[PDB]
Structure formats: C-alpha cells, structure tokens
Amino acid sequence: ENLYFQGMNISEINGFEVTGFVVRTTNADEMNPMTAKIGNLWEKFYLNAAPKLTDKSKVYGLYTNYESDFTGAFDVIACSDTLSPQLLSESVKTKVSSGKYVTFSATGEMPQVVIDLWNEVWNYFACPHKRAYTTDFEYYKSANTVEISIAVR
C-alpha cells in the first residue's frame, strides 16, 4: 500500500469543539461510488470553509450520532476547531468529549492513506477493546499524515 503505518496507541484525549458541514450516511452508501456522500461533503468544505481557515486551524472528520453500530447510519462532519457556526453558513458546532481512545496513525498519499487507515481500524476491532460508538474522528494532522481516534468503552 506504500504507506507508513505508524501503529496504534491507547490514550486519554482532551475534548474539543469543532464546526463544519454534516451529512448523514451509511457504510453501504459510501461503498457504492454513485451514492457516496463523504467526497461531496469534503468538496463543500474545500469550497465554503477552507478559505476561512488559518495556519493554526486543525481539520477533522467526525463520525458521530450513530444510529446503532457500524451497520447503521451515522453523521459525518467535515470541520475545524477555528470555524464558528456564524463565520460559516449552514454549519453545525459539535463538542467532542474527553475520553479513552485507540488512535491509529499513518502517512502517505492523501486520501489513499485515510482510506487504508480505516482498514487497519476494521481489522483491529474485528480484540482488547470495544467501540463506544459515541464520537470517532479523523484528524488531518498534516498534508500526508492522518490519525483516526476511535472512542472505546
């Protein structure tokens, strides 16, 4: 896969607030290229939100409001800590809670690296830990490095 898989680490993470665009989807909708929503969500973010970011802006992909488990619907939120629901129209503010997470990290071509990192997440949980299905997140640490933090019970 031509990725550097840095590995996984369990840790306590401090909560934080982020604002951005939300869409509701399912894994099945995302697997079908013709019905996927996450790509379009990010294009909207690039279009409407990116021009308003700063050099210290942190950018995230939140997965939250889970209907059930990985087989159910969930909200995906393309967002950033420096945006606010009134510096940006149609946006929603979410608080990610402090808690215990398992965090995975990889570096490579984007977005290949985030797609493939989710596969590592899948393999791992499908296990010493159980998913909380509260709020999980991609953190786009740099142009080539992404972390995925999964909330665990």
Numbering used by the authors: -6 to 119, 123 to 149
What did the original publication write about this model?
We report the 1.8 Å crystal structure of Cass2, an integron-associated protein derived from an environmental V. cholerae. The structure defines a monomeric beta-barrel protein with a fold related to the effector-binding portion of AraC/XylS transcription activators. The closest homologs of Cass2 are multi-drug binding proteins, such as BmrR. Fluorescence assays demonstrate that Cass2 is capable of binding cationic drug compounds with submicromolar affinity.
Structure determination by x-ray crystallography revealed the protein Cass2 to be a monomer organised into a barrel-like form comprising an antiparallel β-sheet of eight strands. The topology of the domain highlights its pseudo two-fold symmetry, which is based on repeating β-β-α-β-β motifs. The central cavity enclosed between the helices of Cass2 is largely hydrophobic in nature, and aromatic side chains predominate. However, a single acidic group (Glu134, originating from strand β7) is buried deep within this cleft, flanking the pseudo two-fold axis of the protein structure. The polarity of this side chain is stabilised by hydrogen bonds to side chains of Tyr56, Tyr136, and Trp111. Between the helical edges of the cavity and directly above the topological switch-point of the sheet (i.e. β3/β7), density is observed corresponding to a polyethylene glycol (PEG) molecule captured during crystallization of Cass2. Hydrophobic side chains from helices α2 (Trp35, Tyr39) and α3 (Pro104, Val107, Ile108, Trp111) and the β7/β8 interstrand loop (Tyr136) are within 4 Å of this ligand. In our structure of Cass2, the site occupied by PEG correlates closely with the location of the cationic drug-binding cavity of BmrR. The loop segment following helix α2 in Cass2 appears to be relatively flexible in our structure, and it is thus feasible that access to the ligand site in the gene cassette domain might occur by a similar helix-opening mechanism, perhaps coupled in this case with expulsion of the interior side chain Tyr39. Despite being a single module, Cass2 retains some of the hydrophobic features of the interface, as well as possessing protruding charged side chains, including Arg149 (as its C-terminal residue).
